[PDB]
C-alpha cells in the first residue's frame, strides 16, 4: 500500500526492541548469471536464505539489483533523514515455503522481502565489490547476459552493522509489493568503482534511481536496534 522508495524519518520510526535477531545465510549463495537490463545491473543467485526477524519463516535469495546516479553525491533510492547515499544494492528474497515459485510469490504482500545495502563513495577501494565491476566488461550492451566470471561471496557485501529499518512497500519498479529490510550503515566503495556502471548502454546510463514517495498515514517504519 506504500509506494517505494521513501525517506526514512528516524524520529518517526517505531522501535521494535523485542524481535528475534536477523539471520543471514549467504555462505551457500552462488552467483549464476549477470544481466545488463538496459536500466540496471542484475546478478542472479542460487542458494542462500534469510530468517527472521519479523519473518514468519525463511525466504530464499533469488537476485541482487544495483542503483546509482550521475553524481557520487546522489544515487540511492531510499533516504534516511533526507540523506541520500551514492548508491543502493537490493537483495530480493522470496517466500518459497508458502508459494511454488517467484512468480506466485510476487502476487502477495508476504511473498517478497528485499534487503537494502547502501553504497558510500569514499577514498576506499572495496576489493569485494570489485568482483562485481570486473563482470561489467562482459555486459556493456543491453539487454545482455553473461555467466558470473569467478569466485564471489555475497557475505562480503554485508555492512559492518546489521541494525535495520523495515516497512511494507513495493519493488522499485512498482511491479509488486515487497517488505523492505534497510541497513543505515553503508559499505564503502571508490569513485573509480561506481563510474564503471555509467558506461553501460541503455538502448548512456548516467542515472537509474527513483525519487522517494511521501509516507502514507497508515505506513509504519519499524526499527530493529
Amino acid at each position, epitope marked *: *500500500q506504500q*509506494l517505494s522508495p521513501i525517506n526514512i524519518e528516524t524520529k518517526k520510526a517505531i522501535s521494535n526492541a523485542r524481535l528475534k535477531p536477523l539471520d543471514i545465510h549467504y555462505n551457500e549463495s552462488k552467483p549464476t548469471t549477470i544481466q545488463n*537490463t*538496459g*536500466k*540496471l545491473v*542484475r546478478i542472479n543467485f542460487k542458494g542462500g536464505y534469510i530468517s527472521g526477524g519479523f519473518l514468519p519463516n525463511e525466504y530464499v535469495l533469488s537476485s541482487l539489483h544495483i542503483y546509482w546516479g550521475k553524481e557520487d553525491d546522489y544515487g540511492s533510492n531510499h533516504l534516511i533523514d533526507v540523506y541520500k547515499y551514492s548508491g543502493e544494492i537490493n537483495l530480493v528474497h522470496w517466500n518459497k515455503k508458502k508459494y511454488s515459485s517467484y512468480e506466485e510469490a510476487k502476487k502477495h504482500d508476504d511473498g517478497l522481502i528485499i534487503i537494502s545495502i547502501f553504497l558510500q563513495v569514499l577514498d576506499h577501494k572495496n576489493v569485494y565489490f570489485q568482483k562485481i565491476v570486473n563482470q561489467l566488461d562482459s555486459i556493456r550492451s*543491453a*539487454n545482455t547476459s553473461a555467466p558470473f566470471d569467478s569466485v564471489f561471496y555475497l557475505d562480503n557485501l554485508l555492512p559492518s552493522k546489521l541494525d535495520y529499518f523495515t516497512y511494507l512497500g513495493t*519493488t522499485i*519498479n*512498482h*511491479s*509488486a509489493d515487497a517488505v523492505w529490510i534497510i541497513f543505515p550503515t553503508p559499505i564503502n566503495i571508490h569513485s573509480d568503482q561506481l563510474s564503471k556502471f555509467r558506461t553501460l548502454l*541503455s*538502448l*548512456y546510463i548516467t542515472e*537509474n534511481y*527513483r*525519487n522517494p*514517495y*511521501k509516507l*502514507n*498515514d497508515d505506513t509504519e517504519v519499524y526499527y530493529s536496534g
Partner: antibody
Amino acid sequence: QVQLQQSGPELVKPGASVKISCKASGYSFNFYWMHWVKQRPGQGLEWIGMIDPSESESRLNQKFKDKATLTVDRSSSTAHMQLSSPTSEDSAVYYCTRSNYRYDYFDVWGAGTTVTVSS
Amino acid sequence: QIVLTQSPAIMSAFPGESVTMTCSASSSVSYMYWYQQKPGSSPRLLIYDTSNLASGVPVRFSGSGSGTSYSLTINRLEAEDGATYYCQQWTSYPLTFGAGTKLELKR
C-alpha cells in the same frame, strides 16, 4: 522525435482475441514504463496496467486481470496489449502512454487505437 | 482503490472568467496530477505534483490542494481551454482518474 505510434482501428469478433501495438521511437525504450489507458465513449479514463520494458515485469489493474496481457518486443521497441475473449464492454479507445522514469507523469501519448467488439 | 470525484461534471464560462474545478479523493493523496483532453485528441499533462505547471502551460492555469481535496483553477479562461480535465492520483495502485470536468465556453 520522441513518439508513440499505435495500430489502426480494429473490428473484433466477440470472443476473438485481439492484439494491439504501440511502437516507440526517439528515446531509450527499456528505460520508461509503458502504460495502457482505456477510454469508453462515456466513461472517463481507466488505467489498465503498466509494464517495465527492461524485464517485461507488468502490473495489471485487477479490474483487467483476466482481460489484458501486457508484453514488449525489446528488439522492435514495441509494447503490446492483448485482449482475451473480448465483449462489447471492451469496445473503447486504448492509449499507450510513457511515464517519465523520474517524474510520475505521462509525458508521451499515442493517438489511441479504437477497438470495436461487435458481430 | 482510490476513487476520485470531480465536480462539476459539466460547466461553462465566458472567456476572461475564473474557473475552478475540484477533485475529491476517497482517501489521502500525496500529489494530484491534471490532464487536459481536447475533443478528438489524446490526454495531455497540464499539472504535475499538485501545483507544478507542465512545460509550456500558460500561467493562467494553477493547481492546489492536499489530503483528500484538490482543485484546478483557470484564471482568465480562453476559448482554446475548452476541454475535459481529469485529475489523477499516484499514491496507490491501481492508478485512477476522476470522471472528468467537461468545460465549455459561453458567448
